[PDB]
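Each lists chain and fold; for instance:
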Amino acid sequence: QGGYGFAMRLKRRNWYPQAKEDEVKLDESDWEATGLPDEPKELPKRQKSVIEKVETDSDNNIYSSPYLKPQPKNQAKDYENFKYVYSGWFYKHAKREFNLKVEPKSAKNGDDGYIFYHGKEPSRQLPASGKITYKGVWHFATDTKKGQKFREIIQPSKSQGDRYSGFSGDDGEEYSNKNKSTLTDGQEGYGFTSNLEVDFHNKKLTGKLIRNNANTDNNQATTTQYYSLEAQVTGNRFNGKATATDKPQQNSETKEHPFVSDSSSLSGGFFGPQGEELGFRFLSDDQKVAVVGSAKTKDKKLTTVLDAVELKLGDKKVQKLDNFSNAAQLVVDGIMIPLLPAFTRKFDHTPKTYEVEVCCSNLNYLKYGMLTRKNVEQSMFLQGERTDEKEIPSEQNIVYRGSWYGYIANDKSTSWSGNASNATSGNRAEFTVNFADKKITGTLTADNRQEATFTIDGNIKDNGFEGTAKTAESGFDLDQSNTTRTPKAYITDAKVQGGFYGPKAEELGGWFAYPGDSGNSSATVVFGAKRQ
């Protein structure tokens, strides 16, 4: 799926009879994108505005989860103070609606708001191995029918579950230990919280969505687990299944809560430097419960999983784009640009005017090319999903053929820029990689030239490569028709960086910018190649 964050709208049923709404189910269709948050403690900007426009009556304050920053607690105890992700809810008590002039006669009562999670900086690298505890908080919101859930939202006074949704933050709901000041002694923390484990070695995620209990009455508990979570990590995203712990076993009985159905659409992602924070969400297949949450690591050997760079024409510093382990989706300035509906295509996307040329059609896990935005700024990009560190082959001599985008100037003279090509004469690249010897060798060759424009030599490390890039010792030469002493691009040791991409390193890609962080040569290039 991909995304910075997601939110869902509280429902409110037309409880007026005759009309007989009787049931308002949730829907995948109801998930809304949050957009990039500038400060993740703040509310989702787009949807906090939908609420302010709500109208309103009597009370007009917007209530939100404790940790948020527009005396209850909602914490996993040493998991703690997030920096990159937040999940939660916010609401205001909405005006009752009543209308006998409209068909089919409407009546509505109760809170209105959102549950949401959002995040900054989708993770670029993760740990190579080990099992790491992530602990956080979570939040739910139910459909509306005929009520009710005595077990976690107090006395259906306002008809929580019936007239409106009822949710992690209803007034309204006091069986969690959120107002108590001492820890349950069965621990975890305050409120509805989560206990996830991430197995980076096996790319597996598991854990539990518990509730820390106000008291030890009933025949329960200290802690009451409502969900187990299983997910397979795929890049910096995870996907999978949420299992409902306390299901009505005999089917000839209903439970006093809504957490009675499994979910096959748990979705989430890591955020921060090493994916040391996550954010996730699901919708149960009965379409009755919706959940979001986030998780951390405390406070008191890495592997990079993707490459996403922006090469400013013509700048010394490479920029890092955000990406969701989707090469076919380009993430710039919080906007999402699909690189699909023949070799390279060029198109205009206006969400303030983006012109992109993207290569290539013969690539699936790597995409690169030309990025120009108006309002006229020009740059290059390369995005790719790295092959797993354990999946890079060990066989000597493997050959890759592809193409490149280039820009080469002399500051005294003129400039040459070439686009990517599958033409026999057009821009073109070739590589010879030797795993085990851990070497990469290749050539970049400008359109309608014969000599190699760039020779490339570096070293394979894990799923990436790092090396040098140099023009012919006789220099590059910028406008061939000019048959005199003029130009003359001299690129010495340009720093090239790259990685291998997808299933078993079937694609590779690199970029370099010269000079990087008393000469007049300048270069900015990205290239991709596919295994032959």
